[PDB]
Design a protein around this nucleic acid. Structure first.
Length: 86
DNA sequence: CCAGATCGTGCGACACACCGGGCCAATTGGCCGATGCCGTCCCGCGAACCCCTCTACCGTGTTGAGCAGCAGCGGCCT
C-alpha cells in the first residue's frame, strides 16, 4: 500500500496502480513466451478490455524526465534550458 | 480691292433664379400583438471512482595543485 501511495510524483489511485502492474506482468509474460512484442489487440483480448483502455493504462504509468539532465557534451547546458515558455 | 471671322448689337428662347406655396409619391420602421422553440435547472437513476479494511502451514540481516585543520607521537619539564 505504501509503495502504491508514495512511489510516483503524480500520484495514481491504488486500483489504477494494480491495473498497471497487471498489464505490465501480462505484457512481460507474453513477450517472453511468444518471442515477439505483443500488439495492442493481443493484450486487449488477453486482458479483456478495449485497446483504448490498454493504451491509456500504458500512458498513465510513465515517469517524468528531469529538467537537469545534461545534453551538452562539454557539460554546460541542460534539458530545461531549451524549453520555451509558451 | 473686298469678304468671312470677330465682335457689336438685337430679338427671341429659355434653362432655369428666385422665394414662396400647396399638395403628394415612395418608403417607411417601429415592434402592436400573437404564436412558438430553446436555455436553464432540478431532479432521477446509475456507472465509475476513490478510499478504507482484512488473510493465520510459514517466514526473522543491505588528477594536479594549493591551502588548512586534526590525530598520533618524540621528546622536554615538572
Amino acid at each position: 500500500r505504501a509503495m502504491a501511495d508514495q512511489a510516483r510524483t503524480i500520484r495514481i489511485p491504488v486500483h489504477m496502480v494494480e491495473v498497471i502492474n497487471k498489464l505490465a506482468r501480462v505484457q512481460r509474460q507474453m513477450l517472453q513466451d511468444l518471442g515477439r512484442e505483443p500488439t495492442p489487440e493481443e493484450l486487449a483480448k488477453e486482458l479483456d478490455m478495449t485497446p483504448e483502455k490498454v493504451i491509456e493504462v500504458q500512458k498513465y504509468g510513465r515517469e517524468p524526465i528531469s529538467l537537469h539532465t545534461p545534453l551538452g557534451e562539454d557539460g554546460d547546458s541542460e534539458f530545461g534550458d531549451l524549453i520555451e515558455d509558451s
